[PDB]
Amino acid sequence: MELIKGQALFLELDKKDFLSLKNNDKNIPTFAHPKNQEKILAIFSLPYKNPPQNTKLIAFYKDKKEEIFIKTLEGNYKSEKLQVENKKIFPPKTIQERIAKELKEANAIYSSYTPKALFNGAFNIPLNSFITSDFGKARTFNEKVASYHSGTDFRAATGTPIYAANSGVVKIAKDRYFAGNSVVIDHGFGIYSQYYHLSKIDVKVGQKIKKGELIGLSGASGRVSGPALHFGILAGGKQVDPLDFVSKFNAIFQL
Numbered sequence: 001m002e003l004i005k006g007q008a009l010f011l012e013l014d015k016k017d018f019l020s021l022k023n024n025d026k027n028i029p030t031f032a033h034p035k036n037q038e039k040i041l042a043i044f045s046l047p048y049k050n051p052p053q054n055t056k057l058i059a060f061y062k063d064k065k066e067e068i069f070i071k072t073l074e075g076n077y078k079s080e081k082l083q084v085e086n087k088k089i090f091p092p093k094t095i096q097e098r099i100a101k102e103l104k105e106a107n108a109i110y111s112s113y114t115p116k117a118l119f120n121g122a123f124n125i126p127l128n129s130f131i132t133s134d135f136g137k138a139r140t141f142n143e144k145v146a147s148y149h150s151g152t153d154f155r156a157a158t159g160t161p162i163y164a165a166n167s168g169v170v171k172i173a174k175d176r177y178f179a180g181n182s183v184v185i186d187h188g189f190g191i192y193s194q195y196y197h198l199s200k201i202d203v204k205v206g207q208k209i210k211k212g213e214l215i216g217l218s219g220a221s222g223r224v225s226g227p228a229l230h231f232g233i234l235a236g237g238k239q240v241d242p243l244d245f246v247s248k249f250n251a252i253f254q255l
């Protein structure tokens with residue numbers, strides 16, 4: 001199979017006699033195919049930065065092992081040279097500690113696997129706008145990726161209502177350094193939607209929300225380049241192309 005870096009893939013496996021899906025010694029979780037009773041599904045995601053060239057997954061069955069080969073593709077991402085390699089910046093210690101703290105909290109939430117569907121049918125777009133900056137737009141030095149856009153920016157004047165892309169449980173609902181006023185929703189199966197730079201948060205941690213329910217107001221919080229909604233998807237442990245993901249998910253769970 002082939003997969004563009006920074007994208008997710010839905011692997012289809014036979015259910016009967018299935019034991020384990022493995023990436024070397026890492027376990028990949030599985031969930032029901034919602035239409036085909038004989039199949040299960042796994043989410044496999046490639047990181048945008050420094051992906052392997054090739055992956056081998058092994059589905060272990062009681063009666064057999066099946067190897068899955070995935071070739072990593074570069075895709076057609078927008079990319080710009082910078083002319084300063086200053087990878088080590090010297091923030092104030094207050095900033096350094098807030099970032100490290102918020103990183104630790106995020107890692108703990110994305111670690112808490114929900115082995116159940118919290119969602120309800122297809123993902124909606126969180127507002128009726130258009131993309132102003134694409135997922136995966138890269139900054140390069142040494143023909144190497146130094147940084148990338150890890151979600152997608154929607155056109156939103158300050159105070160635009162933002163609605164939950166799908167049902168789930170709010171796990172983050174506060175002000176963070178890089179994301180500003182942030183909402184993060186667990187949808188189950190390690191799938192998380194992310195709404196950043198909000199001017200107002202209308203949900204609390206641990207709240208069950210419904211698809212199309214108000215989660216806050218768009219803003220420019222934490223945003224140098226002006227007001228927008230930043231929308232992200234974390235799936236299979238990685239930030240992935242969110243409209244590509246929503247499209248692949250919806251093809252499976254719409255009906």
Ligand SMILES: CC(=O)N[C@@H](CCC[C@@H](NC(C)=O)C(=O)O)C(=O)N[C@H](C)C(=O)NO
Pocket residue numbers: 103106148149150151153176178179184194196223230232239
């Ligand atoms: C690096 C990147 O392109 N986008 C994300 C980071 C991904 C979410 C994840 N990490 C943090 C720090 O929150 C989490 O821990 O939940 C961001 O915060 N702002 C970007 C610059 C933007 O482009 N705004 O428009």
Ligand SMILES: [Zn+2]
Pocket residue numbers: 133149150151152153229230231
């Ligand atoms: Zn963004």
